[PDB]
């Protein structure tokens, strides 16, 4: 803002004109002073305006390109995360029972609702009350979905271990009742 190309000419002309004015010369030198300084300031005006426009344009361009780079970095990391999640969840497919039921299909297509029903290794049961409990998972082994399951653990709504010896009719009102029962496939998968 102080070393512009026209600054040298403008300042030198102003200094010379004002020295001539301080010399106390005639009115012709004053008119020449006025004209020269007017045109000098007029030419300095656009040189002082266009540069300021250009700097702000350049700054906006820099900011936009920086934010584009940040967006690309975020895209790369989200792609890596999705790939990792897929390849991690792949490793639990039990690729022998799944293959055994896929090959029985006449064209390779099977409903999705029967894959956990015939290939899962673990079963989870949520029981509202004792009357429902004694009709579904009474004892230590029960049958569901044409398979045999054996109990492995029982917890309550607070996630604390509960032993089957205290799930009775008298002791029912002393438990956080949304009980969760975990079982394993017997003779088949786990």
């Amino acid at each position: 803002f102080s070393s512009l190309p026209s600054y040298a000419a403008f300042a030198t002309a102003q200094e010379a004109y004002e020295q001539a004015v301080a010399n106390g010369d005639s009115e012709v030198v004053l008119k020449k002073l006025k004209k020269s300084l007017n045109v000098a300031k007029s030419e300095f005006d656009r040189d002082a305006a266009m540069q300021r426009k250009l700097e702000k344009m350049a700054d906006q361009a820099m900011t936009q390109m920086y934010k584009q780079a940040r967006s690309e970095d975020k895209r790369a990391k989200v792609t890596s995360a999705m790939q990792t999640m897929l390849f991690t969840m792949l490793r639990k497919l039990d690729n022998d029972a799944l293959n055994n039921i896929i090959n029985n299909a006449r064209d390779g297509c099977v409903p999705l609702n029967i894959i956990p029903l015939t290939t899962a290794a673990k079963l989870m049961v949520v029981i509202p009350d004792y009357n429902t409990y004694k009709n579904t998972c009474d004892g230590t082994t029960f049958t569901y979905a044409s398979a045999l399951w054996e109990i492995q653990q029982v917890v309550d709504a607070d996630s604390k271990i509960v032993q089957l010896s205290e799930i009775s009719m008298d002791n029912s009102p002393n438990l956080a009742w949304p009980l969760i029962v975990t079982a394993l496939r017997a003779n088949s998968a786990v």
Binding site: P111, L112, P116, V126, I180
Partner: protein, 620 residues
Amino acid sequence: NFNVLFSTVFPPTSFGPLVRKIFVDGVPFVVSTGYHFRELGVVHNQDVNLHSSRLSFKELLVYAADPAMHAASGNLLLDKRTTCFSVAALTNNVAFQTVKPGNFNKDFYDFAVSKGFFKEGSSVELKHFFFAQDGNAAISDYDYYRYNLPTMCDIRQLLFVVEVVDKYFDCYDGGCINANQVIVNNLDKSAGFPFNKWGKARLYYDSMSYEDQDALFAYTKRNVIPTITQMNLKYAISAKNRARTVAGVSICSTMTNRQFHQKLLKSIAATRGATVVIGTSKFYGGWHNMLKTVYSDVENPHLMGWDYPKCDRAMPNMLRIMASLVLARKHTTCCSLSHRFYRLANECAQVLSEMVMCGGSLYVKPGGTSSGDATTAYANSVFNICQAVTANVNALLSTDGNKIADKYVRNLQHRLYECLYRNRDVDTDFVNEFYAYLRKHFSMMILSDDAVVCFNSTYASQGLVASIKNFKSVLYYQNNVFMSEAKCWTETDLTKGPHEFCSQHTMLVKQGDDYVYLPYPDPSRILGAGCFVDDIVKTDGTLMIERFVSLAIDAYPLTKHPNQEYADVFHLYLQYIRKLHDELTGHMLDMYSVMLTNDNTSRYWEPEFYEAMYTPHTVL
């Protein structure tokens, strides 16, 4: 219609996505390559490749939204809390979610009490609170889908009601738009499951460039992509103590539904003077204009309003299909015949019957609407118009034609029967005639399952126009609900507007020289919003003074009410605003030394700033 009836015989485990095994660089996957609908039969994908190299970004997005892998890599689940079908459990624990109470603003309550409020025997009292819920509330609320039953329809009458509804939806334009013309507001909201583990919608709208979005949108015109919906509990003020739940749809569904429907949705919300009043505001004389439009030139005017019990849990599937088909009728040039069917199949597989994730488990949604998709309110309006039209048809066709004095109405009834049960193709002249008859004798104003009707009264008494009983019968035999007439009103004096529309009452006041209609809310709602807040930082008024300015804007028209406490609410709000401002200025000048000025701040505690919001002169 026939598929709906025939699908009730076959086992329920043979419906849904169909999966198979594909190979990517020698490793086996499990992906969905089709669907088996209860209504649309068997649908197979068109672009499926078994052997492929390393996959791209949009393939990752598609494979990460499919429920196939999540269901196949999870444990079996047998849930006895509900009677809906259960698929699998994604973890080893069950999640129980509670709802917390509200926060008490003691300063406002003390200020209100010190001014003669909340006395015994008063007509203004608090009945809006924050209710708390226990652990097993989300599943208990989800178990209300048991009211959705398979319903067969009268096809020869639905095929005419749909024509009349399409006549109603005729003044708009629509079609498909490119990915660079989509307008999204608030990109800082959730993206659904499983996309909420890595960021909000901003991350996925920035990481995806324009031709990626275009390719993804063009992918769903030849394939079906099933997704997963997450259920969340609301934390808001209310007057009843039942839990409220909304549905969070996945990003892959919203991103394409916007490109499919946004042009028509924006064209609907920009028209004034139509039947659907979505987009019209109530400030600057909007309410008066809407009320004058709905009155039209009916001859013996009465007013009527009704209510839908369990509107979204009990709406049959066929009406949702009809609403989607009616909305998708603007694509006669931009889309082919197979593209439209595949778009319909995608919509059905994503927002009508899909896997929902409640707690930490996957369930099967029987039917109904999932409030939270990209086209909720407009579909609700289409459904409301359809129900009104069939109620009118049933009212007219079930009248002894030997006692109709007017011969024009008798000929109209004869032609209606002929066009329903003796004509196989559309007859446009009679559709236009019936539409004109309905618009002359039965005027409606619809906003997403809320409606006000101005109808001819002598015609309704003689049975030539629908009544409340007709709505009750239609709801009973077509919606599987009972509509008690204790939630419906009727007004025989037009100088007092509708008894209730969008939770607002109507009063006819004199402003300027003429008389206009103004809406006012329930005072208890305003006071409850004042006294009970979510967040702790809103129990310090000086930090947020702009809350009370908006609350006083909402409560202005209460000063014209003949009852006296109603105006006292507005005056109390103004005095509290002034007290808060004085507190801020003095409380800041004291310990610090910053001196505050009261330039153009006194406008907020004088009535002229608020009076200008209900006077017809558009501003800003």
